[PDB]
Coordinates of C-alpha atoms in Angstrom, one line a residue:
Chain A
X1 CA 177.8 201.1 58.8
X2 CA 179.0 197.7 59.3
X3 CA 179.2 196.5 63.0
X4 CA 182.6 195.0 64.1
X5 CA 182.3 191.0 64.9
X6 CA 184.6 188.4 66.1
X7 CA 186.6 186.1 64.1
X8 CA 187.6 189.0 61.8
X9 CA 191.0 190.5 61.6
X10 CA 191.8 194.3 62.9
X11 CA 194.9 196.4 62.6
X12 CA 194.0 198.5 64.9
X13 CA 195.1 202.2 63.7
X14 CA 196.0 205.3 65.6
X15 CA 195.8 208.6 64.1
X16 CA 198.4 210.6 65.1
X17 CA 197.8 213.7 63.3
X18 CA 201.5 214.8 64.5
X19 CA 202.4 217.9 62.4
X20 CA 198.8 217.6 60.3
X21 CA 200.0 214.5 58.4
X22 CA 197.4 212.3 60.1
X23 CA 200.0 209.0 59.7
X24 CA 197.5 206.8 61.3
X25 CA 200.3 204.7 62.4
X26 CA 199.3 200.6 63.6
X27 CA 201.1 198.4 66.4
X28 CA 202.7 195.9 65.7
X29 CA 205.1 193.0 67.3
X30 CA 206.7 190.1 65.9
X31 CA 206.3 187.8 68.8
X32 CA 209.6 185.8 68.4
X33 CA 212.7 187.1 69.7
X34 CA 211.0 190.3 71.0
X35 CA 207.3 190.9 73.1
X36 CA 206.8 194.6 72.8
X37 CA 204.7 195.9 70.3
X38 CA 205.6 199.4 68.3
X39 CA 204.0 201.6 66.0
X40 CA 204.9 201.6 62.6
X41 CA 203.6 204.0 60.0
X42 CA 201.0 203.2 57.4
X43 CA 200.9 206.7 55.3
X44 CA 203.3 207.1 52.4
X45 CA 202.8 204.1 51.0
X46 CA 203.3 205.5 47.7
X47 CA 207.3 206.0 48.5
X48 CA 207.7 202.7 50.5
X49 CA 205.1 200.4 51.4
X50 CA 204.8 199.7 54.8
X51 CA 205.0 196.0 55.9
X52 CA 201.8 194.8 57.6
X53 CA 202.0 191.0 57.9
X54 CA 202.8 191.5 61.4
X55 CA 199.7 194.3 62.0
X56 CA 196.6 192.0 61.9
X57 CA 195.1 191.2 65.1
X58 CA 192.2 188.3 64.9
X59 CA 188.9 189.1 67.3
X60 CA 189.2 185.8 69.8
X61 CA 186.7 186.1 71.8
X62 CA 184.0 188.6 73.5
X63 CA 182.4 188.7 76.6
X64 CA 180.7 191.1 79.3
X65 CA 182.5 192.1 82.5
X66 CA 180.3 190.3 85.1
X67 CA 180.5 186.7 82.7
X68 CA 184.2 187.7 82.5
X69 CA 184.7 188.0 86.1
X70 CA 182.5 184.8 86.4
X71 CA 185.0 182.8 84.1
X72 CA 188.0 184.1 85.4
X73 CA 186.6 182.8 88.9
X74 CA 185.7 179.6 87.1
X75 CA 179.6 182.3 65.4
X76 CA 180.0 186.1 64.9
X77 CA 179.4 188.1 68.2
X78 CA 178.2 191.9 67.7
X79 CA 181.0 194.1 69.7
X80 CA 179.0 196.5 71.7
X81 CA 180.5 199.3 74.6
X82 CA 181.7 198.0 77.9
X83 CA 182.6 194.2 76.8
X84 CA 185.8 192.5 77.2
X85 CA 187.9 191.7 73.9
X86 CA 190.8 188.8 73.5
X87 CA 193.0 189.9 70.9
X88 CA 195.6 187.1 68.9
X89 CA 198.5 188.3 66.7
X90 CA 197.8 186.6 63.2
X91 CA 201.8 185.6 62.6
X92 CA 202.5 184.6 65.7
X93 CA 199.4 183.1 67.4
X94 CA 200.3 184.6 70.9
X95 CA 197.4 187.3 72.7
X96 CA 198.0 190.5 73.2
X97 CA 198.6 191.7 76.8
X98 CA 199.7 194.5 79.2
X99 CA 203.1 193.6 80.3
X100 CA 203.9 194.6 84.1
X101 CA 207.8 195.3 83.2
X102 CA 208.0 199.8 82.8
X103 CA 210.9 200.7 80.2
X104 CA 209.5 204.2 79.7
X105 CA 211.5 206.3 82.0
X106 CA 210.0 209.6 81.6
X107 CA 206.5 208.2 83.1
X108 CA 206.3 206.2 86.6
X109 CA 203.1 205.1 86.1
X110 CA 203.5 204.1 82.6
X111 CA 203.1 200.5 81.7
X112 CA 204.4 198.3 78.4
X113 CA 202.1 196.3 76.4
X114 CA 203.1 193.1 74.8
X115 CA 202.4 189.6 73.3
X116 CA 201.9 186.8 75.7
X117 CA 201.7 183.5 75.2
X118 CA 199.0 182.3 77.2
X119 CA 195.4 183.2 77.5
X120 CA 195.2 182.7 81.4
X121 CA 194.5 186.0 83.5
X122 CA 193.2 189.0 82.9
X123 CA 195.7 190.9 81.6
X124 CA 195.5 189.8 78.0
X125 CA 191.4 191.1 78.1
X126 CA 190.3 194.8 76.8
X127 CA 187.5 196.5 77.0
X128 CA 185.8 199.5 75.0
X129 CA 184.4 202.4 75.7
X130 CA 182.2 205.0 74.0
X131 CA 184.7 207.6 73.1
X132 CA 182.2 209.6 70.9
X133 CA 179.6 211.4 72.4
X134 CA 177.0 210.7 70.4
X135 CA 177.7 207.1 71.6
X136 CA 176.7 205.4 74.9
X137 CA 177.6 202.5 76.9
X138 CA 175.8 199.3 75.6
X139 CA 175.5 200.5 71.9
X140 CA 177.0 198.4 69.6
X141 CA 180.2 199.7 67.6
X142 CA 180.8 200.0 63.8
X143 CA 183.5 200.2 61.2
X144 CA 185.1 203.8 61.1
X145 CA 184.4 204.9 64.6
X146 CA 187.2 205.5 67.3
X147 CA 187.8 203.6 70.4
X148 CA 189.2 203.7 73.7
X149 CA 190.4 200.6 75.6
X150 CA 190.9 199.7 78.8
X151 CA 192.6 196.6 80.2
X152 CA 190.3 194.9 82.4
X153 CA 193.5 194.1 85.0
X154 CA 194.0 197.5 85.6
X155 CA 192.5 200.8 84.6
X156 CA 194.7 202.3 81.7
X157 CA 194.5 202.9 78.3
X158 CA 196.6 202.8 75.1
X159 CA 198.3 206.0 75.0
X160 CA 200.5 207.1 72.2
X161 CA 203.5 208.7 73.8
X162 CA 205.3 211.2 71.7
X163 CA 207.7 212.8 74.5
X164 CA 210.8 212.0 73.6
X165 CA 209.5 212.6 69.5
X166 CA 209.4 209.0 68.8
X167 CA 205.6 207.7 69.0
X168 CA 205.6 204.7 71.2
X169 CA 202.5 202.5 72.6
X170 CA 202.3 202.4 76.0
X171 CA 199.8 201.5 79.1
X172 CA 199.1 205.1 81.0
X173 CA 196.2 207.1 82.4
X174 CA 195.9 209.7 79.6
X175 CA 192.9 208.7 76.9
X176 CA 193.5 208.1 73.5
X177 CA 191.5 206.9 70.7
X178 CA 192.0 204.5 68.5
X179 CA 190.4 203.5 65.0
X180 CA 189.2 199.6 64.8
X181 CA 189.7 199.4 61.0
X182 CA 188.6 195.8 59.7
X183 CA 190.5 194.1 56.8
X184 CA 190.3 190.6 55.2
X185 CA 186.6 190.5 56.3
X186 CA 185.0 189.6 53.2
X187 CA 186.7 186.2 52.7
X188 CA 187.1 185.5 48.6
X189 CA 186.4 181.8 48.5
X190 CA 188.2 180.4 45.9
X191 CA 189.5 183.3 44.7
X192 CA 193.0 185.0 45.4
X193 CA 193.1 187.8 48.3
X194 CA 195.4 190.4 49.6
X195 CA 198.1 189.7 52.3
X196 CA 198.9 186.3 51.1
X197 CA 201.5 184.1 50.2
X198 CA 201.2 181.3 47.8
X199 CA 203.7 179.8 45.0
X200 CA 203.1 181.7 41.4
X201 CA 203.0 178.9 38.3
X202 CA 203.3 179.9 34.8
X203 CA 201.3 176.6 34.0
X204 CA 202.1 173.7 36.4
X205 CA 205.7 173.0 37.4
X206 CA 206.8 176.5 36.9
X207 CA 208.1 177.7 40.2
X208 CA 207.1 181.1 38.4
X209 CA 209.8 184.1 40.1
X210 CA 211.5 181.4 42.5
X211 CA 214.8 183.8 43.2
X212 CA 217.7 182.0 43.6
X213 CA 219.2 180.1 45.9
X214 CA 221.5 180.9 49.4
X215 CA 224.7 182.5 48.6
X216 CA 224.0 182.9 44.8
X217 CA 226.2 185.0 42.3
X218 CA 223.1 186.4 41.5
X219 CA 222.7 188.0 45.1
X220 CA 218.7 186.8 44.7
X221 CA 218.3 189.5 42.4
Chain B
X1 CA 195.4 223.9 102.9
X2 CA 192.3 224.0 100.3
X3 CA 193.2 219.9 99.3
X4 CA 193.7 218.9 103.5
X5 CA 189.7 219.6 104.2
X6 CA 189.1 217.2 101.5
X7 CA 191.7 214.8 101.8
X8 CA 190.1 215.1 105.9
X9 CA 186.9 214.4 104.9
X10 CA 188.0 211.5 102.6
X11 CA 190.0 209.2 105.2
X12 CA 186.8 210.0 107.4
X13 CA 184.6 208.4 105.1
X14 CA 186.9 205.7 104.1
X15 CA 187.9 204.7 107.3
X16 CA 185.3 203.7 110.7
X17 CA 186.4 202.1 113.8
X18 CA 189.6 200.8 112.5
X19 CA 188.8 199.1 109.5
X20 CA 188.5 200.4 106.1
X21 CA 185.3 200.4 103.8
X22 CA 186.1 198.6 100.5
X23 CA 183.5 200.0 98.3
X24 CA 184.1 203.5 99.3
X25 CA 187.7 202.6 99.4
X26 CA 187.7 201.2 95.6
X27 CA 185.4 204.2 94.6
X28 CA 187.5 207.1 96.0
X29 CA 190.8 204.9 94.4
X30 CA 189.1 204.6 90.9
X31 CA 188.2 208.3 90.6
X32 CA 191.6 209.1 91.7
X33 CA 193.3 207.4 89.5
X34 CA 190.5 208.2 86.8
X35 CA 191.3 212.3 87.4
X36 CA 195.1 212.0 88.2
X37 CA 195.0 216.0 89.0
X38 CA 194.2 215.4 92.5
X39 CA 198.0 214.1 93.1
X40 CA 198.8 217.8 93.1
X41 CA 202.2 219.0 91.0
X42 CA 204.7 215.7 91.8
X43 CA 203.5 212.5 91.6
X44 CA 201.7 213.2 88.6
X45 CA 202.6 212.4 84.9
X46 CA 205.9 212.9 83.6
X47 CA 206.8 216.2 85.3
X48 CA 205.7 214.7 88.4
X49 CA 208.8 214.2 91.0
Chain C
X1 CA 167.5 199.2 80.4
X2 CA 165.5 197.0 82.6
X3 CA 167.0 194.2 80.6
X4 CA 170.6 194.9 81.2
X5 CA 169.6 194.9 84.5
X6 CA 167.9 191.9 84.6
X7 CA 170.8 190.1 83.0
X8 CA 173.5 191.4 85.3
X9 CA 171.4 190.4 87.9
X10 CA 171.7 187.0 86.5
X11 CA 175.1 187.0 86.2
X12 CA 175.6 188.0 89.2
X13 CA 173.2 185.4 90.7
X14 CA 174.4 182.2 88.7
X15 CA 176.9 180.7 90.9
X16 CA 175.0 180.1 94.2
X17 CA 173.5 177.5 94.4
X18 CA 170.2 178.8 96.6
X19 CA 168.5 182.4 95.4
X20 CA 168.5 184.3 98.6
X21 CA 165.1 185.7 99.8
X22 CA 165.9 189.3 98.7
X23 CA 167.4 188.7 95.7
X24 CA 163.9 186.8 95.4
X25 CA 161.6 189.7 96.2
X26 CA 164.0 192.0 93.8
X27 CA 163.5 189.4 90.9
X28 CA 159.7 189.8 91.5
X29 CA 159.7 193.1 91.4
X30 CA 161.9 193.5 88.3
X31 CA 159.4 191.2 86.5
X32 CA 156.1 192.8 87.6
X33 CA 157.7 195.8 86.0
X34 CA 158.6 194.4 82.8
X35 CA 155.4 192.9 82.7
X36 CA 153.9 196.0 82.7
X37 CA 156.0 197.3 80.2
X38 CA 155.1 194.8 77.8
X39 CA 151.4 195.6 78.2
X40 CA 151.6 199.1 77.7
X41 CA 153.6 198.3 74.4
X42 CA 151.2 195.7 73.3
X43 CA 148.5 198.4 73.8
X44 CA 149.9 200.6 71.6
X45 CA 150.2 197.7 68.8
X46 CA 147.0 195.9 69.8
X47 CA 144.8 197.4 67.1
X48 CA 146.6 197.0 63.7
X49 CA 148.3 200.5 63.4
X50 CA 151.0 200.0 61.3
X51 CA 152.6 203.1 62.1
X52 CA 153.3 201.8 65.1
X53 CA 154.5 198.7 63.9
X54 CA 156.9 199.8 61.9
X55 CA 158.6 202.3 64.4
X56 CA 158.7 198.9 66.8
X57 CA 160.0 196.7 63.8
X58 CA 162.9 199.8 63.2
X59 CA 164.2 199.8 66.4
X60 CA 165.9 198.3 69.5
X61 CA 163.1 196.0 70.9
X62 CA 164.8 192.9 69.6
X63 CA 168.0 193.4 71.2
X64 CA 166.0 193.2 74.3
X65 CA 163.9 189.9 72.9
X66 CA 167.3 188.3 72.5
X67 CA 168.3 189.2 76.0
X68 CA 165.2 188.5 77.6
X69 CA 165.1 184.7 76.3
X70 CA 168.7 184.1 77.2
X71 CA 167.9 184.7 80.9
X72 CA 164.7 182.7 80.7
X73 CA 166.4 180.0 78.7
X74 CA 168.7 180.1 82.5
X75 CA 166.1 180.9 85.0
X76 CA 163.5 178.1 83.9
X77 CA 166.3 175.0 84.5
X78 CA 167.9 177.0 87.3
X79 CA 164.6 177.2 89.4
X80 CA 163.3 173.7 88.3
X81 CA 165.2 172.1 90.5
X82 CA 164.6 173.6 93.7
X83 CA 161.4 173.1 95.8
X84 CA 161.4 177.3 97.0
X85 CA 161.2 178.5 93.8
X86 CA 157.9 177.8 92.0
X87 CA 156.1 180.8 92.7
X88 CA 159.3 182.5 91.3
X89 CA 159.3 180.2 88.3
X90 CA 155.6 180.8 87.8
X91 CA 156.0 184.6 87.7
X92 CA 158.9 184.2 85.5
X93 CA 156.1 181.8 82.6
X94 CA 153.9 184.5 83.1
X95 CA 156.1 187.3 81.5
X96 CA 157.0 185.1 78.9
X97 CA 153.8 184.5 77.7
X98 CA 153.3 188.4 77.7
X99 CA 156.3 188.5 75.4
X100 CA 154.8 185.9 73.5
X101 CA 151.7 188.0 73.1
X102 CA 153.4 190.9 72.3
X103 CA 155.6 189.4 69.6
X104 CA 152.1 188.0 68.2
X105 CA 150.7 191.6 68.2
X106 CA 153.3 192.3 66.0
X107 CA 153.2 189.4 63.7
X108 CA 149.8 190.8 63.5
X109 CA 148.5 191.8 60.2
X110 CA 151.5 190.5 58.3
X111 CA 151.2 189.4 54.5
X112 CA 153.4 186.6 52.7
X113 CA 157.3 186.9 52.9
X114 CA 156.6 190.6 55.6
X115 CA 159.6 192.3 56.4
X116 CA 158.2 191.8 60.1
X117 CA 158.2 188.0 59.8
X118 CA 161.6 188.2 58.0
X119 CA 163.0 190.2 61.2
X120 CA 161.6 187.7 63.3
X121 CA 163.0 184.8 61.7
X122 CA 165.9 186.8 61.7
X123 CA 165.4 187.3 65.5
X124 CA 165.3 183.6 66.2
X125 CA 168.1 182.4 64.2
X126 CA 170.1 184.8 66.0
X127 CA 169.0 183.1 69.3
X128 CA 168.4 179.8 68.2
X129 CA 170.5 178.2 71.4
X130 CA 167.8 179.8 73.9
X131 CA 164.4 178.9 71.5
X132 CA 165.9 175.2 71.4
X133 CA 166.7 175.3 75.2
X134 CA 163.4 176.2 76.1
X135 CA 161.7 173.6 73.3
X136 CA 163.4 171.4 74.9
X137 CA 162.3 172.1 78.4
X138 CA 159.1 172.0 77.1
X139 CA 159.0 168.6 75.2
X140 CA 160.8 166.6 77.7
X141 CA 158.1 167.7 80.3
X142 CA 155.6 166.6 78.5
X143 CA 156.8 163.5 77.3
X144 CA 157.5 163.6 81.5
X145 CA 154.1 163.3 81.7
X146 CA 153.2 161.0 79.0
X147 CA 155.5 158.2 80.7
X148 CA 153.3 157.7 83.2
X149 CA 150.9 155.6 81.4
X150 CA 154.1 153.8 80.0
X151 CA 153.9 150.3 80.9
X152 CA 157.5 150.0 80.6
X153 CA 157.8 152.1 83.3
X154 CA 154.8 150.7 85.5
X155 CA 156.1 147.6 85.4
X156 CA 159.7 149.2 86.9
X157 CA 156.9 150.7 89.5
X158 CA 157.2 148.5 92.8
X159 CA 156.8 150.4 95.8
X160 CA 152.7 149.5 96.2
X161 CA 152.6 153.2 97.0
X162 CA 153.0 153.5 93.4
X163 CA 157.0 155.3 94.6
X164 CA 159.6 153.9 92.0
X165 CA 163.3 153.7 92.6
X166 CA 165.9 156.3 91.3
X167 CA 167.6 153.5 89.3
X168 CA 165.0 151.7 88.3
X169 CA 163.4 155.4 87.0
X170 CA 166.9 155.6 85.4
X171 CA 166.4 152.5 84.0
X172 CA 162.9 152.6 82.7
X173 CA 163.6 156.2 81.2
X174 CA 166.8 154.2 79.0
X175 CA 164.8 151.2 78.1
X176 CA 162.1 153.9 76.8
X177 CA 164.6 155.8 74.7
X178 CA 162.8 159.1 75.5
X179 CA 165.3 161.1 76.7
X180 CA 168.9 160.6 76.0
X181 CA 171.8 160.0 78.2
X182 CA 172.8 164.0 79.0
X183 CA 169.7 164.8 79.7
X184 CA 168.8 161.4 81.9
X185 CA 171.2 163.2 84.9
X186 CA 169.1 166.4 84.5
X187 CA 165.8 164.5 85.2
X188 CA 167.3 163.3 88.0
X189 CA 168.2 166.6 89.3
X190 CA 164.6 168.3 88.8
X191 CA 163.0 165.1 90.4
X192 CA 161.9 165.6 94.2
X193 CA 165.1 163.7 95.3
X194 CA 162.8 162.2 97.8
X195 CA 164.5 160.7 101.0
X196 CA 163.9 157.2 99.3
X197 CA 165.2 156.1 96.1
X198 CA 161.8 155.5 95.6
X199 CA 160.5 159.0 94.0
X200 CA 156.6 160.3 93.2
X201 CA 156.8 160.5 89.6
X202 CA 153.4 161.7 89.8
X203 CA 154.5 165.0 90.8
X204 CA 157.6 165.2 89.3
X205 CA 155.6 165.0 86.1
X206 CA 152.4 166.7 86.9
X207 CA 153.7 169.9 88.2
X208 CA 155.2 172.7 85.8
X209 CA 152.0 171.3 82.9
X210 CA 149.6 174.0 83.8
X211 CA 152.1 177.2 84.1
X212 CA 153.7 175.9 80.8
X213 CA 150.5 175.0 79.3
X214 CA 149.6 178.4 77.8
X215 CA 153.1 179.5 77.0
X216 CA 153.4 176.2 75.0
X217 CA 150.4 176.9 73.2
X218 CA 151.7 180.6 72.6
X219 CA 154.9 179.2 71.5
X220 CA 153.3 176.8 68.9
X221 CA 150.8 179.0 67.3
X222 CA 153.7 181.6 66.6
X223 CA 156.0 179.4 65.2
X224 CA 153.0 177.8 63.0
X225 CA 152.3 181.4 61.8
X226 CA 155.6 182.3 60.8
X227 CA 156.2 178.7 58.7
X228 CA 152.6 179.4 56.8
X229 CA 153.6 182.9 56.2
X230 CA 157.2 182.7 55.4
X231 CA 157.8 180.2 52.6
X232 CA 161.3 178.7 51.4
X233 CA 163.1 179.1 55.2
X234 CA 165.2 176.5 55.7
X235 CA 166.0 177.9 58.9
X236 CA 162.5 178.0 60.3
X237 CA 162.3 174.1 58.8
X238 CA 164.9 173.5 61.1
X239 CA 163.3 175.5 64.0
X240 CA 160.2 173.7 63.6
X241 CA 161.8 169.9 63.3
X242 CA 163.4 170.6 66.6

């Protein structure tokens, strides 16, 4: 029943539920050599584990639409309904955005989200909305409870397009919802977490399963 | 011929003495765009010419 | 719901400069509403049912505390200044006090270490930016008042009027060390800008004593109750050394 705050990390999962598997798959984007984001699949982890250094998304900033508008012209925050949302890619420190450029043929009005590199505008700011019933505008959210957003630039929504059989990510006017799942919120201080990279030391001096080097007879095996 | 009576009675609202009324103007676009069924068959989705 | 309103009103209303007259008379409205509101609800907790209590303690009035003191914490240094405003700003003391009295309602009754007092600690250090604001609006005021019998400012005093200069007031205000160097420009600002350098401090320092008199007093005897009854809070130590 935890509420969602900023300065925490999201990967932002979409259930698919595409021939009742229920992948759940996540966006993701590198954000060097290539803007546009993708989903990737986070079920069967058992028979490959899916990569997800590039699937955390860190919880910028929050603000209403009126102060939004306000600054536009011009320290955990509770995310409630109808705010706006900056979202920055964790690996490559860019926000995430709705590009204008439309590679989706199939839909005209379609519209291609992406990783920009600058906060200015509007079109790097999302906003939420009670997808649930039971939920109203102005209530504040929690973990486990599905989303719809909105980009506050123009009036669209993250729809999972599954057309042509591949399930792409892409700015359109059908709804979709989308599951705000938190991770590496409770911070182990001083003590060793998931998703990170450090240098293992049987001892000191160790350089503990350092493969081998470039070009190696032991093909860094 | 049932959508012309209400597309009709749309521009009439929208539009008085030759200028157009932006709050009724951004209303009727948002809920247009919000319920993309009122662009009839075409122009609508991807089977939309 | 009145309180989303309130606050979108505010945002709405926080880049001009002058309030106009209607947005005026809707603000008063708005406020003789919520004024009401809060006397019905005190009413309800007036006589110690803790029923009551409890169902106001579980629930979403403190959402709505927070909110309300983040637009005072605007309204009360965005209406000092102006000259049209003080029946506005007057209005505006008077529901805070009723919120004041409402909150003490609740605190009510209370025992050592309450789960009511530890909510509204709770409550406070979640808006501690608006509670010092408003402590400071408070303090400076009065200290405002308390530099007229300053002799270090008397002196600076040369108009035989008894008007003193806007420099010299400057001046006298950074030899007393009163009020620091931020908050020096913001003086400046609320003072009658008079068509002279030469301003009536006695105004500018007798006027907003009585309307915040009473809140004041609210304000102190609640935060006195909640440090007696809520040992070990390092958090209200902090509150009440602001």
């Amino acid at each position: 029943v935890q509420f969602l705050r900023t300065d925490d990390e999201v990967v932002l999962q979409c259930s698919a539920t595409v021939l009742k598997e229920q992948l759940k798959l996540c966006l993701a984007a590198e954000g060097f050599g290539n803007r546009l984001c993708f989903l990737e699949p986070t079920s069967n982890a058992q028979n490959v584990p899916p990569d997800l250094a590039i699937c955390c998304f860190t919880l910028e900033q929050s603000l209403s639409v009126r102060a939004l508008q306000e600054m536009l012209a011009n320290g955990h925050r509770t995310l409630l309904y109808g705010h706006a949302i900056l979202l920055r890619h964790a690996h490559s420190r860019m926000y995430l955005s709705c590009l204008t450029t439309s590679r989706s043929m199939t839909d005209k009005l379609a519209f291609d989200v992406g990783l920009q590199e600058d906060a200015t505008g509007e079109a790097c700011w999302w906003t939420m909305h009670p997808a649930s019933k039971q939920r109203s505008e102005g209530e504040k959210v929690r973990v486990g409870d599905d989303l719809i957003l909105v980009s506050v630039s123009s009036e669209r929504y993250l729809h999972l397009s599954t057309a042509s059989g591949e399930l792409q990510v892409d700015a359109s006017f059908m709804q979709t919802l989308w599951n705000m799942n938190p991770i590496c919120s409770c911070c182990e201080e001083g003590y060793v977490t998931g998703g990170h990279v450090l240098r293992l030391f049987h001892g000191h001096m160790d350089e503990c399963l350092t493969i081998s080097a470039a070009d190696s007879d032991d093909q860094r095996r | 011929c049932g959508g012309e009576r209400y597309l009709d009675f749309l521009r009439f609202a929208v539009f008085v003495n030759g200028e157009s009324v932006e709050e009724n103007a951004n209303v009727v676009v948002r809920l247009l765009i919000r319920k993309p069924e009122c662009f009839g068959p075409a122009l609508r989705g991807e089977g939309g010419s | 719901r009145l309180q989303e309103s309130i606050s979108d009103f505010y945002w709405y209303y926080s880049g001009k400069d002058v309030i106009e007259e209607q947005g005026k008379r809707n603000f008063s409205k708005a406020m003789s509403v919520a004024k009401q509101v809060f006397n019905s609800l005190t009413e309800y907790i007036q006589g110690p049912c803790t029923g009551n209590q409890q169902s106001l303690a579980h629930s979403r009035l403190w959402d709505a505390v927070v909110g309300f003191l983040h637009v005072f914490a605007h309204m009360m240094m965005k209406l000092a200044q102006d000259s049209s405003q003080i029946e506005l700003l007057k209005e505006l003391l008077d529901l805070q006090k009723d919120m004041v009295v409402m909150l003490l309602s609740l605190l009510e009754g209370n025992v050592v270490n309450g789960m009511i007092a530890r909510q509204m600690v709770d409550m406070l250090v979640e808006s501690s930016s608006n509670v010092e604001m408003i402590l400071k609006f408070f303090d400076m005021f009065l200290k405002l008042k308390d530099i007229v019998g300053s002799e270090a400012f008397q002196d600076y005093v040369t108009d035989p009027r008894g008007l003193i200069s806007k420099k010299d007031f400057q001046k006298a205000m950074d030899s007393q060390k009163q009020f620091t160097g931020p908050e020096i420009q913001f003086l400046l600002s609320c003072s009658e800008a008079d068509e002279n350098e030469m301003i009536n401090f006695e105004e500018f320092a007798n006027r907003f004593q009585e309307p915040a008199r009473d809140i004041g007093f609210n304000v102190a005897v609640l935060l006195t109750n909640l440090s007696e009854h809520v040992p070990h809070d390092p958090r209200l130590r902090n509150f009440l050394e602001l």
